[PDB]
Design an enzyme around this catalytic site. Structure first.
Site, PDB file in Angstrom:
ATOM      1  N   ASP A 195      -5.749   2.198   3.768  1.00 59.30           N
ATOM      2  CA  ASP A 195      -5.309   0.826   4.307  1.00 59.30           C
ATOM      3  C   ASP A 195      -6.414  -0.320   4.349  1.00 59.30           C
ATOM      4  O   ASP A 195      -6.381  -1.646   3.973  1.00 59.30           O
ATOM      5  CB  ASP A 195      -4.510   0.732   5.646  1.00 59.30           C
ATOM      6  CG  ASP A 195      -3.093   1.608   5.237  1.00 59.30           C
ATOM      7  OD1 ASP A 195      -2.670   1.720   4.432  1.00 59.30           O
ATOM      8  OD2 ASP A 195      -3.021   2.293   6.453  1.00 59.30           O
ATOM      9  N   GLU A 218       1.066  -1.302   0.104  1.00 57.98           N
ATOM     10  CA  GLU A 218      -0.017  -0.062   0.009  1.00 57.98           C
ATOM     11  C   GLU A 218       0.943   1.040   0.087  1.00 57.98           C
ATOM     12  O   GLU A 218       1.813   1.352   0.854  1.00 57.98           O
ATOM     13  CB  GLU A 218      -0.986  -0.005   1.196  1.00 57.98           C
ATOM     14  CG  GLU A 218      -1.628   1.316   1.382  1.00 57.98           C
ATOM     15  CD  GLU A 218      -2.670   1.842   0.344  1.00 57.98           C
ATOM     16  OE1 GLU A 218      -2.869   0.910  -0.537  1.00 57.98           O
ATOM     17  OE2 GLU A 218      -3.007   2.834   0.347  1.00 57.98           O
ATOM     18  N   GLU A 275      -1.107   9.409  -4.828  1.00 59.67           N
ATOM     19  CA  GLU A 275       0.053   8.854  -5.026  1.00 59.67           C
ATOM     20  C   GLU A 275       0.328   8.542  -6.379  1.00 59.67           C
ATOM     21  O   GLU A 275       1.959   8.120  -6.800  1.00 59.67           O
ATOM     22  CB  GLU A 275       0.073   7.677  -4.011  1.00 59.67           C
ATOM     23  CG  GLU A 275       0.202   8.244  -2.527  1.00 59.67           C
ATOM     24  CD  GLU A 275       1.496   9.061  -2.302  1.00 59.67           C
ATOM     25  OE1 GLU A 275       2.627   8.309  -2.549  1.00 59.67           O
ATOM     26  OE2 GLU A 275       1.172  10.228  -1.882  1.00 59.67           O
TER      27      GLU A 275
END
Ligand SMILES: Nc1ncnc2c1ncn2[C@@H]1O[C@H](COP(=O)(O)O)[C@@H](O)[C@H]1O
Length: 449
Positions: free
Chosen positions: A432, A262, A292
């Protein structure tokens, strides 16, 4: 909604800690102003200490962060100040922290077959945070022994604690002649990256047993690379620990397992580039958000595509960025999630069907909706509350666009709307949760084949 997930064993590493949280109110900040002085705090805020050496440092950095509403994290100058800080600014509650600790306890709640969690430090106070079903790897008598954390703790071991201070939006107080209103709810964190207390690594005594761990396990989830430092006082560097992290994956992968990563938000661009160079090319699955994936494409040289994603956030551009990640780093699946949707991309030769990839993602949206609305997950029966959260209406529009995009490929592309909660109880660690549910469910369906 039958769960083939319970038949899955998993290994987790490396980061576990204790989270001591304080829920701030107007009365709490007012007490700090009177105790330490309005004029001394203003003088200290102009100084802007990088580290907290005296109690006035914490007071100034906390008030400074509340004024901007932006997140901030300041470490203690020395680990010998821990007992003094905790006796001075008492917490409201303690619970498990860290990506390994939180996810392992969740997977233990979901009745997984075997959940092996590892962390360098294991004090008695920390070992009591683990679920009793979790297993911890221990070497004794020249063999690998899995025992419960409460039976493998060590009294002399130090403890890692993150002191978190939450403040709601619009909290109002007066400092000097200035009236301060919080523009946005956020958290102020007092935490330190491990050095001289522990290190982000698998110890040398356990490294020879990593292939044996990979035999008794179906998949692994590795995290905590954001705690690695550029340089250390003893003379070691980030390359020393990123090389060994690359060794751990190779030893685990001598047996047939799937490794998932992750992508955490790392502020340090130099440590972020290490994860792209050492970890990402060697894992099988990766999950991230739109922010990201643009950071990764920027490191790989796709600056033009990175700017389009950050500025416009069109699904057609995010899909093209995930296909670049898939083909370059020997990955099996790329997962991108936002508040509206969660995207899933695999190669054409993937053993799972298009409808199976959707069922994988449907579980991820239910588990996420449960945690967002409930604030925490303590029982499997709680998943029925996330089921009550309807799908995002705009994501259904994105789903039709992806279906139309396939007008003329070697990719399996699946899009599903997210179950959005309008008034979530919490938002920390939600990424997560979605990513773990998708990867764990993905490994389940592969195991049936
Ligand atoms: N109110 C909400 N309801 C459901 N999911 C949410 C909500 N807020 C955030 N999320 C999810 O949390 C994720 C955040 O992950 P990250 O920013 O990577 O930590 C987003 O991509 C959303 O999928």
């Amino acid at each position: 909604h039958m769960e083939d997930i319970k038949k899955i064993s998993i290994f987790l590493a490396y980061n576990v800690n204790v989270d001591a949280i304080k829920y701030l109110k107007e009365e709490d900040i007012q007490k700090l102003i009177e105790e330490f002085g309005e004029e001394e705090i203003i003088e200290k805020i102009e100084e802007y200490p990088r580290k907290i050496k005296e109690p006035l440092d914490f007071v100034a950095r906390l008030i400074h962060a509340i004024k901007t509403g932006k997140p901030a994290a300041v470490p203690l100058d020395n680990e010998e100040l821990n007992k003094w800080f905790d006796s001075l600014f008492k917490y409201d509650e303690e619970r498990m922290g860290g990506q390994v600790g939180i996810i392992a306890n969740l997977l233990a709640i979901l009745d997984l077959k075997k959940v092996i969690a590892y962390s360098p430090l294991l004090s008695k106070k920390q070992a009591e945070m683990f679920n009793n079903d979790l297993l911890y790897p221990i070497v004794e008598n020249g063999k690998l022994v899995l025992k419960k954390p409460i039976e493998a703790y060590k009294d002399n071991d130090p403890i890692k604690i993150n002191r978190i201070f939450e403040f709601k939006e619009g909290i109002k107080f007066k400092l000097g002649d200035e009236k301060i209103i919080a523009p946005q709810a956020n958290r102020f964190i007092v935490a330190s990256r491990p050095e001289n207390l522990a290190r982000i690594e698998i110890k040398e005594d356990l490294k020879k047993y990593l292939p044996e761990i990979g035999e008794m396990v179906d998949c692994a989830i590795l995290s905590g690379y954001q705690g690695i430092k550029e340089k250390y006082s003893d003379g070691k560097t980030a390359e020393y620990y990123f090389k060994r992290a690359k060794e751990d994956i190779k030893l685990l992968k001598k047996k047939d397992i799937k490794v998932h990563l992750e992508f955490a938000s790392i502020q340090n661009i130099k440590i972020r580039k290490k994860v792209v160079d050492y970890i990402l090319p060697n894992v099988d699955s990766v999950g991230m958000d739109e922010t990201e994936i643009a950071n990764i494409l920027n490191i790989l040289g796709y600056e033009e595509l990175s700017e389009k994603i950050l500025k416009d956030s069109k699904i057609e551009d995010v899909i093209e960025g995930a296909k670049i990640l898939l083909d370059k780093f020997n990955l099996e699946v790329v997962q991108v999630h936002t508040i509206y949707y969660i995207l899933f991309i695999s190669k054409k030769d993937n053993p799972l069907s298009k409808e199976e990839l959707k069922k994988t993602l449907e579980f991820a949206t239910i588990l996420a909706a449960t945690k967002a609305k409930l604030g925490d997950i303590k029982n499997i029966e709680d998943l029925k509350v996330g089921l009550k959260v309807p799908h995002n209406k705009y994501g259904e529009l994105l789903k039709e666009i992806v279906e139309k995009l396939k007008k003329k490929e070697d990719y399996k592309i699946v899009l599903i709307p997210s179950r959005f909660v309008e008034n979530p109880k919490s938002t920390v660690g939600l990424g997560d949760t979605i990513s773990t549910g998708a990867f764990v469910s993905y490994v389940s369906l592969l195991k049936k084949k």
